[PDB]
């Protein structure tokens, strides 16, 4: 119950944002041909700093060589690499622990299960690629 949060406003999230990418955000970006950095600019209408965690990068490197273009996208120089103090576990678990320990990232992901478990935590907006672009759900500073 941090000093920033209102009832559900969560006013420590502000421009420029910091998003956390899941492993199937990348897949549906490559599939629907949106681009990471400009796609988040085109929805949030603010600067962005996509972040990728050591658990997620390990998972990408675990996929193999059929998915090497997504790995090429993830080692891009202007996607920063947040390092994580973990054993090295499943990606979605590492995302949930990051979210609970700081409550100032928005989470870009596409699996339904991780969507539910994030939605329990109050004040964490939740980007996801749908249709043709990056729709954002629980952010009260949209337009």
């Amino acid at each position: 119950v941090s000093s920033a949060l209102f009832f559900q406003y969560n006013q420590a999230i502000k421009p420029p944002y910091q998003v956390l990418i899941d492993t199937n955000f990348i897949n549906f970006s490559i599939q629907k041909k949106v681009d990471i950095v400009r796609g988040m600019m085109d929805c949030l209408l603010a600067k962005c700093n996509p972040l990728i965690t050591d658990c997620v990068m390990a998972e990408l490197e675990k996929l193999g060589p059929k998915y090497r273009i997504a790995l090429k996208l993830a080692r891009d120089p202007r996607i920063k690499r947040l390092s994580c103090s973990h054993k090295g576990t499943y990606a979605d678990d590492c995302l949930v622990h990051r979210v609970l320990q700081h409550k100032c990232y928005i989470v870009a992901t596409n699996d339904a299960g991780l969507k539910q478990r994030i939605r329990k935590i109050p004040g964490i907006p939740l980007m996801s690629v749908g249709g043709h672009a990056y729709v954002i759900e629980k952010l009260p500073d949209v337009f």
């Binding site: 490559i30 041909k33 681009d35 400009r38 273009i69 090429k72 996208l73």
Partner: protein, 129 residues
């Protein structure tokens, strides 16, 4: 029957590099296949290659080296104006700063960021990324 010879060439390269082979044999070979391949070669997607010569259409042998993710042809060679360059490269590339759309202008066969500089346009052939 056989209509696009370039489509056959790029499909044969694509198949025989998916499966991991090392050199490809593509029969026939127009001037367009040589120039499209020299454009792919300049950017490092294929190794050298060589035209072997019978007294017929002629064959090519390409030396692949791994770095090729996809290549293809756009089949009606659509006329592309100068803003349609960037609508085309947003439709058919998975991230808008790698991969090259290749197009046939009055100044040669070239990728798109060379046809931006020279300020030309023309028809559209294919793509690599």
């Amino acid at each position: 029957t056989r209509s696009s010879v370039l489509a056959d060439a790029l499909n044969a390269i694509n198949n025989a590099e998916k499966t991991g082979k090392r050199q490809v044999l593509i029969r026939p070979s127009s001037k367009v296949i040589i120039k499209f391949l020299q454009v792919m070669q300049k950017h490092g997607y294929i190794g050298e290659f060589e035209y072997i010569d019978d007294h017929r259409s002629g064959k090519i042998v390409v030396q692949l080296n791994g770095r090729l993710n996809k290549c293809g042809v756009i089949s009606p060679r659509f006329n592309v104006k100068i803003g349609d360059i960037e609508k085309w490269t947003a439709n058919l590339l998975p991230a808008r700063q790698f991969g090259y759309v290749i197009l046939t202008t009055s100044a040669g066969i070239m990728d798109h960021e060379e046809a931006r500089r020279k300020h030309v346009s023309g028809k559209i052939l294919g793509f690599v990324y």
